């Protein structure tokens, strides 16, 4: 309950600062104006490279999600099985990265 | 696609279906379905045209929605039983949800509307994988959970599947959509005998896999997609027209062909249980499938549609393809009815 | 010589034909071995000798 | 009048033209994915409420 | 199968043999551009293999006993009747042109098969990118109809998308006057029965579409008549090329392995040559096709698969 | 049973009906699909924590991993469709009717 | 009120799902699903499943919804939205007022109307979270589970590199 | 149907009690029909690749016949085993339930009055 | 005189998308023979002076 009070306080202070930052310089009057970019008006080109690095992040993030309970898994009775599956998961992450390397996946985001 | 990568991906498909078959835990059933879909998506996109991307999009959305309904059915089973054994479900609502999810995975009606599009978009070999291998996993799960299936639900799905898969394929000229509506009809026939005697379900599964395997092996051997392209085989190879004659006549269940065997055993088992009306309406529906198989045979084999001049050049090149087990799959799919009591090996 | 190219089956692949005949003879002798073991096991279990 | 027209019409021809009509109406589909998934929704709602199939 | 995916698994890669000398070069020109000896000289000066120009009997030149078969089993058409009667009744013009395009597709498939299976370059003669230059000339002459051109362009649309264009294209500037001069200096009386506007239509489709549509997706060369008489200067121009066009650059083992698995399957190459479009100029009816196919069963070496015919003396068939 | 279970199931059925009525976008279909996954995660987690069934605590992580890899596969399918047509519209996907 | 805090967060969770399921846009759909993932994580955190809620934040909203917003923001740039929103909100608040007045409701199963604190245990678990030990048993017991999950992720990498290649 | 019986012995093609049964003879009509299916497989195999159908691959047609007889013999063994298990389970259930299968008194036809229906 | 084998028009019956075109399913064109559809660009930037140099790029990503 201390956590939700602290989150409410931080969110409320941030929302208050954002409201003040958007509405204090509106009290100034100065003037009005006309107000008419390296690319002028062209459609946004879809980059395949950015999407490939996003999915590569997502897959290695899932493999991290499998790797996360290792500090609690070292406390087990069954250490040989635990150590074998831990080294197995980190080796499968390395095989994922090596297949990402050698079959030309990390190109122009190297 | 890299051939080593193709072998790894096909073994991942087979591993997913094996994990569905062998496992006693519901999460491992769901994991087997996820592995199956995840590895079968590049098999559909082996050619990388827009039709395969559309077909894999439709297939992915249908199998994903089915897998989410499957996990919801598993989770409600964990409510009402507190355990994970793959056996009967301890809830009517989990039974209805899991039967709907397996109906979306089999492509049974009224969840059938993805089967002809995904069959039409992808190549012939991936269509063969889709229509033969992908029926093995949800029929195994339906084989395991039958003490909880609502009778009226599975019979409604079965007769609606047979009527839609029959009254659909009469119009078609594409060969893959004909195989797709044949798939919908045969899955209706398999699920209708499921609660009465499931050995006949496995018998219809084997005979259907043999007949669809023969038909797509012939379609790969001649590279035919439509009715007319199939009917121009007579001058390229006359024997292939005879083989699609006898196998298309088998798939509608002519006596004494071996495609008559499953539905004859199904009507034999459904009248033991005092259902005379329901296999009667089913056999009345199957005659439409038999009719457009007759129409296709009049197109292909019993008549000879006029060819072009370029066929004379293809006379001088015999087929350099891997027609793997095509005489074996043709002999099994037509001349097997004198061995009808072989069905007891599936007990 | 008749054919302007050497055909893929102008000469028999002796490896493949030897595999064919050897595997077929192996299946026949293994079938007859299993059948004789089956009839002897039948007459040993039922005591019909 | 009988044996080229009426007896020819009554058993095979009405069946023939009716299966032709219903074959056209089953594959009268416009191939749009919104149509089919909306029919899946109508399937789920009719199956739950209209048919007592959850009982 | 001597070649399959198991050959690619066990180590037979296609960029081992693919050196810089394995270049695909096509020399083109009109009916009397005189390139037939230039192709042989360029083939004997660059270490490349030469393919003679495919006609009616190219499939006869590959298959069987090699000799040109009778004109009922192969072709059902002629160049000479096309020259005598170009606006013919039965439609032999487009039938001959479709048979020639099928033979050029078989020739180009043999070219890519040689270039990918041996690594030895191929000098071509009027390849599949330069076959519509005769069809459009026939159509502008009114020798054929519109649906023939649409049929050919459908077949082109479902065939040419799978194949890669050659590296170098050499074009021979010969005007129509010298072409007609060499027509009179040949001595073939059917070939002497050709008018002027047909050669002009071939020239127009050449210089307006073929070199402009290949000047970006390959390296085109354009030379006159007299300067092609020394082939060693042409070989000099070939040896100093900066390749930056065509889809040859972005090729791995896998794309060219897909290409090699495609081109050696002759029926899959020849598949959509005969799309089932009932065009009556090329439509051979069922009784006539029956008759010619049963007589094709009667030829020596054509009854069975080629290693099983007992009218030419195949041995050990009972052990095959 | 519990009432929060009814609310998580109603969340699942709401994202179901949002998935079964396409408007325009394929990304909206994938977001309804992952809302279905999220409600499965919440419901399975509440049942597994509530019964103190210890060995199923590793089950929701496996659910999350498999269905997130499923979503990555869906995003790659959507990007191939976006390369084909330009949008992620579902009315572009009408080729396989014939 | 505070006894009903899991119920309040569940109502906010359903309101978020009706908010984005009416589908204004994939951008605002992702926005509403982010807010719904946070409040559903709060639902998980109020039963003592701290690690699974942090798996929600770290993996779901951390990787997957970030990649959804990443793909949405570079590949895209109503009446029915507001109508479906008020329709779903009227259905949900009818259910809320029913269970407020009746303390019992049946939509598909029968449901309680009490606070959902009533379904707990009153003991202690010693020197471990039970759920922490259950996830720590992924390596010592779940050999087959880790094998099939890691193989599915390796094939996931391979599959994505195949189909995003285009060729 | 009988999956409760073969759930304690899993994945056994032919169990240990199958060897109490008489094996199918090598002159069995079922096995000879499967050999005929092997001959037809050889014929269609020569037909699809344009070989002399009755001469080419005597080794190959003999391999088809040998392989189909070899698989079909074990299939007939499993068939006979499963039907023997079916009759054994049925007869043990009849013996273990005498009260459900009553010995009906077989009436002689002098007591059996069927109504005569005349045909005229 | 001899056995009837079909003409062109009888085989035209099996050469469409469906055997029977109705008024709703009449808009269909037949699919491609090799099952490949046609798929149906480079970026340009204008760097202002914000010495001073106005670069105009033609970028390929
Ligand atoms: C137990 C289940 C068994 C299931 C089938 C397993 C075998 C096949 C699996 C792989 C496959 O398809 O391979 C191709 C396949 C050939 O079929 P194909 O691709 O159509 O070839 C067409 C031409 O015949 C190709 O001709 P070719 O010139 O290239 O070479 C001739 C070739 C040369 O042969 C060899 O080289 C074989 C010798 C070496 C084998 C490997 C040894 C290690 O011989 C043949 O192809 C003759 C046919 C072989 C048998 C095919 C049918 C097998 C049985 C299928 C099930 C039948 C069930 C009937 C039940 C009836 C009642 C319900 O099999 C083989 O090449 C080897 C077959 C070995 C048979 C063993 C039988 C006992 C098994 C126990
Ligand atoms: C009793 C309550 C409980 C039972 C269940 C609820 C009721 C269902 C009954 C059984 C099904 C009847 C048919 C319903 C769907 C019809 C097909 C359709 O969608 O048509 C639209 C559409 C038709 O449009 P179209 O193709 O453009 O051409 C129409 C023209 O524009 C121009 O055509 P139009 O202007 O003339 O109108 C066309 C339309 C309009 O038709 C009508 O207005 C007349 C309909 C029949 C009236 C007579 C009914 C008499 C009933 C008995 C009397 C009542 C008292 C009973 C007393 C106790 C019993 C003795 O007719 C059709 O669409 C006919 C085609 C289908 C044959 C119908 C066979 C009827 C059997 C009735 C059994 C009861 O067709 C399609 O979309 C075809 C594909 C459909 C695929 C999905 C269909 C699923 C249907 C499932 C129903 C049950 C669900 C169970 C699922 C549970 C597990 C998951
Ligand atoms: C046996 C029955 C199955 C045979 C299937 C293959 C037939 C075949 O190849 O025929 C040609 C072949 C002779 O051909 P060929 O002169 O060498 O060369 C062919 C030409 O090149 C052909 O020249 P072409 O192709 O250039 O042009 C002519 C054209 C002319 O073609 C046309 O005009 C088109 C076709 C005409 C209309 C359709 C007619 C019907 C065809 C199918 C039958 C359907 C009704 C069956 C019953 C109802 C089920 C639907 O095509 C043909 O004639 C093609 C040849 C094959 C025609 C027949 C194909 C039938 C395949 C399907 C039947 C089997 C499965 C279903 C059976 C159901 C139960 C009985 O005949 C046979 O092989 C017949 C069997 C004779 C030998 C029997 C010896 C028995 C020995 C027993 C002791 C050794 C075994 C011991 C076993 C036990 C050990 C313990
Ligand atoms: C915590 C971090 C720092 C927080 C922010 C800084 C703290 C101090 C905040 C107040 C600063 C002074 C007022 C805002 C700035 C005014 C600048 C300006 O040009 O004002 C002229 C403007 C307008 O004057 P004007 O009439 O000359 O307008 C200029 C435009 N023409 C001439 C074209 C019309 O003044 C105001 O708007 C006055 C607003 C209220 C000022 C405070 C009143 C007393 C409060 C006690
Ligand atoms: C490459 C894979 C390398 C690791 C393989 C597993 C090694 C291992 O820890 O096995 C012992 C582990 C765990 O054994 P354990 O001895 O730690 O288990 C103790 C027993 N309980 C859990 C009841 C307390 O697995 C097994 O014993 C069997 C399950 C999995 C077997 C491997 C399946 C591989 C399938 C490949 C297809
Ligand atoms: C109770 C039941 C329990 C379970 C019983 C067993 C069920 C078994 C079901 C088997 C179904 C097999 C379906 C296909 C499996 C995968 C093989 C495949 O599709 O390979 C495709 C492959 C592609 O090769 P590629 O280089 O891509 O060439 C394509 C064009 N270039 O290669 C090709 O395209 C080659 C073309 C010919 C391939 C023919 C393969 C036939 C195999 C199936 C035989 C029949 C089924 C088995 C017998 C009955 C079993 C019930
Ligand atoms: C019967 C069962 C469901 C009952 C509730 C229905 C919710 C209200 C919507 C009614 C239909 C309105 C509509 O037009 O829906 C179609 C729309 C997709 O189509 P669109 O292109 O946006 O509009 C053109 C018309 N098809 O469809 C949508 O956008 C639907 C979005 C669904 C989101 C569900 C929100 C909760 C609804 C209540 C619980 C279910
Ligand atoms: C060719 C056949 C090759 C068979 C190799 C051995 C396979 C095996 O051991 O199968 C065992 C299985 C019976 O095992 P069971 O536990 O009774 O399975 C219940 C199924 N619902 O036996 C079977 O499933 C055999 C029946 C299927 C045969 C398919 C091919 C014909
Ligand atoms: N439409 C056509 N008209 C005339 N000749 C053609 C046509 N298409 C291909 N050719 C071939 O092109 C050759 C011209 O090249 P050349 O060998 O130099 O005479 C002819 O002899 C024909 O073999």
UniProtKB/Swiss-Prot annotation, chain A:
InterPro entries: NADH_UbQ/plastoQ_OxRdtase_su3, NDAH_ubi_oxred_su3_sf
GO molecular function: NADH dehydrogenase (ubiquinone) activity
The name this protein goes by in its record: NADH-ubiquinone oxidoreductase chain 3
Cellular component, GO annotation: mitochondrial inner membrane; respiratory chain complex I
Family as reported in the entry's similarity comment: Belongs to the complex I subunit 3 family.
Pfam families given in the database record: Oxidored_q4 (PF00507)
Species the sequence originates in: Ovis aries (Sheep)
TM annotation in the entry: 3-23, 50-70, 79-99
A Gene Ontology BP annotation from the UniProt entry: mitochondrial electron transport, NADH to ubiquinone
Subcellular localization: Mitochondrion inner membrane
Keywords: Electron transport, Membrane, Mitochondrion, Mitochondrion inner membrane, NAD, Respiratory chain, Translocase, Transmembrane, Transmembrane helix, Transport, Ubiquinone
Membrane topology (UniProt): Multi-pass membrane protein
Role summary: Core subunit of the mitochondrial membrane respiratory chain NADH dehydrogenase (Complex I) which catalyzes electron transfer from NADH through the respiratory chain, using ubiquinone as an electron acceptor. Essential for the catalytic activity of complex I.
SUBUNIT field: Core subunit of respiratory chain NADH dehydrogenase (Complex I) which is composed of 45 different subunits. Interacts with TMEM186. Interacts with TMEM242.
Major place of residence: mitochondrion
Catalytic activity: a ubiquinone + NADH + 5 H(+)(in) = a ubiquinol + NAD(+) + 4 H(+)(out)
Enzyme Commission code: 7.1.1.2
Curated annotation (Swiss-Prot), chain B:
Subcellular compartments: Mitochondrion inner membrane
Highest taxon of source: Eukaryota
Transmembrane segment boundaries: 3-23, 25-45, 67-87, 96-116, 122-142, 145-165, 178-198, 200-220, 237-257, 274-294, 325-345
Keywords: Electron transport, Membrane, Mitochondrion, Mitochondrion inner membrane, NAD, Respiratory chain, Translocase, Transmembrane, Transmembrane helix, Transport, Ubiquinone
This enzyme's EC code(s): 7.1.1.2
A biological process term (GO) from this entry: reactive oxygen species metabolic process
Catalytic activity: a ubiquinone + NADH + 5 H(+)(in) = a ubiquinol + NAD(+) + 4 H(+)(out)
Coiled-coil blocks: none
Class of enzymatic activity (EC top level): translocase
GO cellular component: mitochondrial inner membrane; respiratory chain complex I
Main location: mitochondrion
Pfam family, one: NADH_dehy_S2_C
GO molecular function: NADH dehydrogenase (ubiquinone) activity
InterPro entries, per database record: Complex_I_Subunit_2, NADH_DH_su2_C, NADH_UbQ_OxRdtase_chain2, ND/Mrp_TM
Bilayer topology term: Multi-pass membrane protein
Subunit structure: Core subunit of respiratory chain NADH dehydrogenase (Complex I) which is composed of 45 different subunits. Interacts with TMEM242.
Described function: Core subunit of the mitochondrial membrane respiratory chain NADH dehydrogenase (Complex I) which catalyzes electron transfer from NADH through the respiratory chain, using ubiquinone as an electron acceptor. Essential for the catalytic activity and assembly of complex I.
Family classification: Belongs to the complex I subunit 2 family.
PANTHER family: NADH-UBIQUINONE OXIDOREDUCTASE CHAIN 2 (PTHR46552:SF1)
Protein name according to UniProt: NADH-ubiquinone oxidoreductase chain 2
Organism: Ovis aries (Sheep)
Curated annotation (Swiss-Prot), chain D:
Superkingdom as given in the UniProt entry: Eukaryota
Compartments where found: Mitochondrion inner membrane
Positions of transmembrane segments: 31-51
Homology family: Belongs to the complex I subunit 5 family.
Function according to Swiss-Prot or TrEMBL: Core subunit of the mitochondrial membrane respiratory chain NADH dehydrogenase (Complex I) which catalyzes electron transfer from NADH through the respiratory chain, using ubiquinone as an electron acceptor. Essential for the catalytic activity and assembly of complex I.
Subunit structure: Core subunit of respiratory chain NADH dehydrogenase (Complex I) which is composed of 45 different subunits.
Protein name, entry field: NADH-ubiquinone oxidoreductase chain 5
Swiss-Prot record, chain F:
Membrane topology designation: Multi-pass membrane protein
Biological process according to GO: ATP synthesis coupled electron transport
Annotated compartments: Mitochondrion inner membrane
Molecular function, one GO term: NADH dehydrogenase (ubiquinone) activity
InterPro entries for the chain: NADH_UbQ_OxRdtase_chain4L/K, NUOK/Mnh_C1-like
Class in the EC hierarchy, top level: translocase
GO cellular component: a single term: respiratory chain complex I
Membrane-spanning residues: 1-21, 29-49, 61-81
Top-level taxon of the source organism: Eukaryota
Keyword line: Electron transport, Membrane, Mitochondrion, Mitochondrion inner membrane, NAD, Respiratory chain, Translocase, Transmembrane, Transmembrane helix, Transport, Ubiquinone
Gene3D superfamilies assigned to the protein according to its UniProt record, in alphabetical order: 1.10.287.3510
Enzyme Commission no: 7.1.1.2
Chemical reaction(s) catalysed: a ubiquinone + NADH + 5 H(+)(in) = a ubiquinol + NAD(+) + 4 H(+)(out)
Subunit: Core subunit of respiratory chain NADH dehydrogenase (Complex I) which is composed of 45 different subunits.
Name of this chain's protein: NADH-ubiquinone oxidoreductase chain 4L
Organism from which the protein derives: Ovis aries
Taxonomic placement: Eukaryota, Metazoa, Chordata, Craniata, Vertebrata
């Amino acid at each position: 309950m201390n956590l939700m009070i602290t989150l409410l306080t931080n969110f409320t202070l941030a929302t208050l600062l954002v409201t003040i930052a958007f509405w204090l310089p509106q009290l100034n009057v100065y003037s009005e104006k006309t107000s008419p970019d390296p690319m002028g008006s062209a459609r946004l080109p879809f980059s395949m490279k950015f999407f490939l690095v996003a999915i590569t992040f997502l897959l290695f993030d899932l493999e991290i999600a499998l790797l996360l309970p290792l500090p609690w898994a070292s406390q087990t009775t069954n250490l040989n099985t635990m150590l074998t599956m831990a080294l197995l998961l980190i080796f499968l992450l390395a095989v994922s990265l090596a297949y990402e390397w050698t079959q030309k996946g990390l190109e122009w985001t190297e | 696609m890299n051939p080593i990568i193709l072998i790894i991906i096909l073994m991942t498909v087979m591993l997913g279906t094996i994990i569905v078959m062998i496992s006693t835990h519901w999460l491992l059933i769901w994991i087997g379905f996820e592995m199956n879909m995840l590895a079968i998506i590049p098999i559909m996109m082996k050619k990388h045209n827009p039709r395969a991307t559309e077909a894999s999009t439709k297939y992915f959305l249908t199998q994903s929605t089915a897998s989410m309904l499957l996990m919801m059915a598993i989770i409600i089973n964990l409510m009402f039983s507190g355990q994970w054994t793959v056996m009967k479900l301890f809830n009517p609502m989990a039974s209805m949800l899991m039967t709907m999810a397996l109906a979306m995975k089999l492509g049974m009606a009224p969840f059938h509307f993805w089967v002809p599009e995904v069959t039409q978009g992808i190549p012939l070999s991936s269509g063969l994988i889709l229509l033969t291998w992908q029926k093995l996993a949800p029929m195994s799960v339906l084989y395991q959970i039958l003490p909880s299936i609502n009778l009226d639900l599975i019979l409604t799905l079965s007769i609606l599947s047979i009527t839609i898969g029959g009254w659909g394929g009469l119009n078609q000229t594409q060969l893959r959509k004909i195989m797709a509506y044949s798939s919908i009809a045969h899955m209706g026939w398999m699920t209708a005998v499921l609660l009465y005697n499931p050995t006949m379900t496995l018998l219809n599964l084997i005979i259907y896999i043999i007949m669809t395997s023969t038909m797509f092996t012939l379609f790969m051997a001649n590279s035919t997609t439509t009715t007319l392209s199939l009917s121009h085989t007579w001058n390229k190879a006359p024997i292939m027209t005879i083989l699609v004659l006898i196998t298309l006549l088998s798939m509608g269940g002519l006596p004494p062909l071996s495609g008559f065997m499953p539905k004859w055993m199904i009507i034999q088992e459904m009248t033991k249980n005092d259902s005379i009306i329901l296999p009667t309406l089913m056999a009345i529906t199957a005659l439409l499938n038999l009719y457009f198989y007759m129409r296709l045979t009049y197109s292909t084999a019993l008549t000879m549609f006029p060819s072009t001049n370029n066929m004379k050049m293809k006379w001088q090149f015999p087929t350099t393809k891997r027609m793997t087990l095509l005489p074996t799959m043709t002999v099994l799919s037509t001349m097997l009815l004198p061995l009808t009591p072989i069905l007891s090996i599936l007990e | 010589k008749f054919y302007i190219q050497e055909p893929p089956h102008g000469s028999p692949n002796w490896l493949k034909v030897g595999l064919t005949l050897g595997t077929s003879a192996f299946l026949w002798i293994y079938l007859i071995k299993q059948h004789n073991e089956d009839v002897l096991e039948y007459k040993r279990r039922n005591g019909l000798e | 009048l009988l044996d080229l027209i009426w007896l020819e019409t009554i058993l095979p021809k009405t069946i023939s033209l009716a299966q032709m009509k219903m074959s056209t109406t089953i594959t009268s589909q416009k191939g749009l994915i919104k149509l089919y998934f909306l029919s899946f929704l109508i399937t789920i709602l009719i199956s739950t409420t209209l048919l007592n199939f959850h009982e | 199968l001597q070649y399959g995916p198991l050959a690619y698994i066990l180590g037979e890669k296609t960029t081992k043999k693919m050196t810089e000398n394995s270049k695909l070069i096509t020399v083109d020109g009109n009916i009397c551009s005189g390139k037939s000896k230039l192709a042989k000289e360029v083939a004997e000066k660059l270490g490349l293999k030469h393919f003679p120009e495919a006609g009616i009997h190219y499939a006869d030149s590959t298959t069987g006993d090699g000799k040109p078969l009778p004109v009922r089993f192969s072709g059902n058409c002629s160049l000479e009747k096309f020259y005598d009667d170009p606006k013919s009744n039965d439609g032999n013009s487009y039938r001959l042109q479709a048979w020639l395009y099928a033979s050029r597709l078989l020739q180009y498939a043999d070219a890519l098969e040689h270039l990918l299976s041996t690594g030895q370059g191929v000098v071509l003669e009027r390849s599949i990118y330069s076959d519509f230059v005769f069809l459009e000339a026939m159509y502008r002459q009114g020798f054929i109809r519109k649906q023939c051109v649409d049929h050919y362009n459908q077949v082109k649309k479902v065939t040419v998308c799978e194949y890669l264009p050659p590296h170098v294209v050499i074009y021979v500037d010969v005007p129509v006057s010298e072409v007609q001069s060499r027509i009179q200096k040949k001595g073939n009386p059917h070939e002497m029965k050709i008018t002027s506007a047909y050669l002009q239509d071939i020239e127009n489709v050449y210089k307006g579409t073929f070199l402009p549509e290949m000047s970006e997706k390959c390296e085109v060369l354009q030379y006159s008549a007299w300067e092609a008489e020394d082939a060693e200067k042409v070989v000099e121009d070939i040896q100093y090329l900066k390749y930056d066009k065509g889809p040859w650059l972005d090729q791995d083992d896998r794309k060219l392995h897909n290409l090699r698995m495609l081109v050696q399957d002759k029926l899959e190459v020849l598949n959509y040559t005969s799309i089932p479009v009932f065009l009556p100029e090329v439509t051979i009816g069922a009784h006539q096709s029956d008759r010619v196919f049963q007589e094709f069963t009667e030829l020596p070496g054509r009854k069975y698969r080629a290693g099983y015919n007992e009218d030419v003396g195949d041995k050990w068939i009972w052990l095959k | 049973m519990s009432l929060v279970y009814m609310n998580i199931m109603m969340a699942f059925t709401v994202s179901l009906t949002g998935l079964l009525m396409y408007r325009s976008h394929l990304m909206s279909s994938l977001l309804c699909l992952e809302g279905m996954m999220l409600s499965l995660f919440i419901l399975a987690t509440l049942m597994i924590l509530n019964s103190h069934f210890t060995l199923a605590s590793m089950m929701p992580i496996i659910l999350l991993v498999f269905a997130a890899c499923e979503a990555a596969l869906g995003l790659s399918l959507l990007v191939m469709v976006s390369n084909t047509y330009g949008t992620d519209y579902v009315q572009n996907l009408n080729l396989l009717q014939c | 009120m505070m006894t009903y805090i899991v119920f309040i967060l569940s109502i906010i969770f359903v309101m978020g799902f009706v908010g984005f399921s009416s589908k204004p846009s994939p951008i605002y759909g992702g926005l509403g699903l982010i807010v719904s993932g946070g409040v559903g994580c709060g639902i998980v955190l109020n039963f003592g499943g701290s690690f699974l809620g942090l798996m929600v934040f770290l993996i779901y909203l951390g990787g997957m919804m970030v990649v959804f917003g990443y793909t949405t923001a570079m590949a895209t740039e109503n009446k029915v939205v507001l109508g479906t929103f008020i329709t779903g909100l009227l259905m949900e608040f009818l259910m809320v007022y029913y269970v407020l007045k009746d303390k019992e409701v049946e939509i598909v199963f029968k449901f309680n109307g009490m606070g959902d604190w009533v379904i707990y245990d009153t003991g202690d678990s010693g020197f471990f979270s039970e759920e922490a030990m259950g996830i720590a048993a992924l390596y010592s017991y779940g050999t087959w589970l880790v094998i099939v999950t890691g193989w599915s992720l390796l094939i996931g990498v391979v599959v994505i590199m195949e189909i995003t290649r285009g060729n | 149907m009988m999956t409760g019986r073969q759930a304690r012995a899993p994945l056994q093609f032919l169990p240990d009690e199958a060897r109490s049964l008489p094996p199918p003879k090598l002159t069995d009509p079922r096995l000879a029909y499967i050999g005929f299916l092997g001959y037809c497989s050889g014929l269609i195999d020569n037909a699809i690749r344009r070989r002399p159908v009755l001469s080419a691959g005597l080794h190959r047609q003999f391999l088809y016949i040998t392989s189909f007889v070899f698989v079909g013999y074990y299939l007939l063994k499993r068939q006979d085993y499963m039907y023997a298990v079916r009759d054994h389970d049925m007869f043990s259930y009849i013996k273990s339930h005498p009260e459900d299968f009553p010995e009906k008194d077989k009436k002689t036809y002098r007591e059996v009055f069927e109504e005569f229906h005349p045909v005229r | 005189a001899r056995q009837w084998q079909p003409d062109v028009e009888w085989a035209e019956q099996y050469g469409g998308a469906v055997m029977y075109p109705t008024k709703e399913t009449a808009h269909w064109k037949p699919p491609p023979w090799n099952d490949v559809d046609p798929p149906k660009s480079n970026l340009t930037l204008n760097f202002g002076p914000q010495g001073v140099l106005r670069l105009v790029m033609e970028l390929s990503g």
